[PDB]
């Protein structure tokens, strides 16, 4: 259907391991959107054609205000182009760089939006498994949107693909290649809540090995400024045993969440 010729490409929005994302406008409609560009030889080499397929299938069919829309795709013998909803306010990653730490209202609002999106995903047994600030985008009203569903699967699942980057957002079962399910995204929510309030993730370390050790032993401590309500939610989410992690409904109705969030469940 679409081809490269139908679009005027604009400024670079960002770069991932595989994605090179650009602002773009469709010529006929003048519709502004984001083009995620992937190099076929890079996908083949790393063997992640299944991730690309997964991303297209899942994001084209999911419909939720806190999940980024994928509209379609096309290709040209060197690259694949995913046609995405454009997120004008950038990433939570950037915003964290800007502000260093988030206040409790901003944190609880993001956690609420995340939890609403994940609740919708999990109802279909879709687990994301790659929740981290670079994959959380902001819409025109500043609302969080989950993107980058390439690592997503239907639960329960094993891990077949190599872990390339940081382990910071991943639970013990996921790193160790054990079977896992929905509860992986709950652990990640805990990591995010801590990072939002503190400015860095709780198991952060100087090496991959040190990071892995901290995660498998669940070794984290709180700075003095983290309030008791936050400590409670975060402690509940960051449990080694997945079955002990709370339900998303329990996150949404947590007293620290309901007192600080500007958005409802
Ligand atoms: N729809 C979008 N709107 C605005 N920026 C985006 C969009 N998609 C991606 N980006 C930016 O590009 C980066 C990489 O995109 P992503 O889809 O995560 O690629 P990868 O799959 O390689 O990680 C994101 O971290 C973000 O900075
Ligand atoms: Cl249209
Ligand atoms: Cl599997
Ligand atoms: Cl996998
Ligand atoms: Cl729930
Ligand atoms: Mg990404
Ligand atoms: Mg990806």
Give a summary of the structure in a few sentences.
With 265 residues, the chain is α+β, with helices and mostly antiparallel strands. Helix content is 37%, strand content 17%. It has 2 domains: 1-90, Phosphorylase Kinase, domain 1, CATH 3.30.200; 91-260, Transferase(Phosphotransferase), domain 1 (Orthogonal Bundle).
Name its key features.
monomer, 265 residues, alpha+beta, Phosphorylase Kinase, domain 1, Transferase(Phosphotransferase), domain 1, 5-stranded antiparallel sheet, two-stranded antiparallel sheet, 10 helices, 37% helix, binds adenosine-5'-diphosphate, binds chloride ion, binds magnesium ion, protein serine/threonine/tyrosine kinase activity
Q: How is the secondary structure organized here?
A:
Elements: E1 7-15, E2 20-26, E3 32-39, H1 40-46, H2 49-61, E4 70-75, E5 79-84, H3 92-99, H4 104-122, E6 126-127, E7 136-138, E8 144-146, E9 153-154, H5 172-175, H6 183-198, H7 208-216, H8 228-237, H9 248-252, H10 255-260
Helix pairs in contact: 4-6, 6-8
PDB class: transferase
Keywords: transferase, protein kinase, mitosis
Assembly: monomeric
Description:
There is a cross-link at residue 132 (Glycyl lysine isopeptide (Lys-Gly) (interchain with G-Cter in SUMO2)). The modification Phosphothreonine is found at residues 161-162. One of its GO terms (cellular component) is nucleoplasm. Residues 154-167 are annotated as: Activation segment. By secondary structure, this protein is an alpha+beta fold. It folds into two domains: 1-90, Phosphorylase Kinase, domain 1 (2-Layer Sandwich), CATH 3.30.200; 91-260, Transferase(Phosphotransferase), domain 1, CATH 1.10.510. The chain is built from ten helices and nine strands. The protein has helices spanning 40-46, 49-61, 92-99, 104-122, 172-175, 183-198, 208-216, 228-237, 248-252, 255-260; strands at residues 7-15, 20-26, 32-39, 70-75, 79-84, 126-127, 136-138, 144-146, 153-154. The strands form three sheets. The protein has a five-stranded antiparallel beta sheet. A two-stranded antiparallel sheet has the order 6-9. Strands 7-8 form a two-stranded antiparallel ribbon. α4 (104-122) runs antiparallel to α6 (183-198) and α6 packs antiparallel against α8 (228-237). The longest helix has 19 residues, at 104-122. The site of one chloride ion has 4 residues, from α9.
């Amino acid at each position: 259907q679409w081809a490269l010729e139908d679009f005027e490409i604009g400024r670079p929005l960002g770069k991932g391991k595989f994605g090179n994302v650009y602002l773009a406008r469709e010529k006929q409609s003048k519709f502004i959107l984001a083009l995620k560009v992937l190099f076929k030889a890079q996908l083949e080499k790393a063997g992640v054609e299944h991730q690309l397929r997964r991303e297209v299938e899942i994001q084209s069919h999911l419909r939720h205000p806190n999940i980024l829309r994928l509209y379609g795709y096309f290709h040209d013998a060197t690259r694949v182009y995913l046609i995405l909803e454009y997120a004008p306010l950038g990433t939570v990653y950037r915003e964290l760089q800007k502000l260093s730490k988030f206040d409790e209202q901003r944190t609880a609002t993001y956690i609420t939006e995340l939890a609403n999106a994940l609740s919708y995903c999990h109802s279909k047994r879709v687990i994301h498994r790659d929740i981290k600030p670079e994959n959380l985008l902001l819409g025109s009203a500043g609302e969080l949107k989950i993107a980058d569903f390439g690592w997503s699967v239907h639960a329960p699942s094993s891990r077949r693909t190599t872990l390339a980057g940081t382990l910071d957002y991943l639970p013990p079962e996921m790193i160790e290649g054990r079977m896992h399910d929905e509860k992986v995204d709950l652990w990640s929510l805990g990591v995010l809540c801590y990072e939002f309030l503190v400015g860095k993730p709780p198991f952060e370390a100087n090496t991959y090995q040190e990071t892995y050790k901290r995660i498998s032993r669940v070794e984290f401590t709180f700075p003095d400024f983290v309030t008791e309500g936050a400590r409670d939610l975060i402690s509940r989410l960051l449990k080694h045993n997945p079955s002990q992690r709370p339900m998303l409904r329990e996150v949404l109705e947590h007293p620290w969440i309901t007192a600080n969030s500007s958005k409802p469940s």
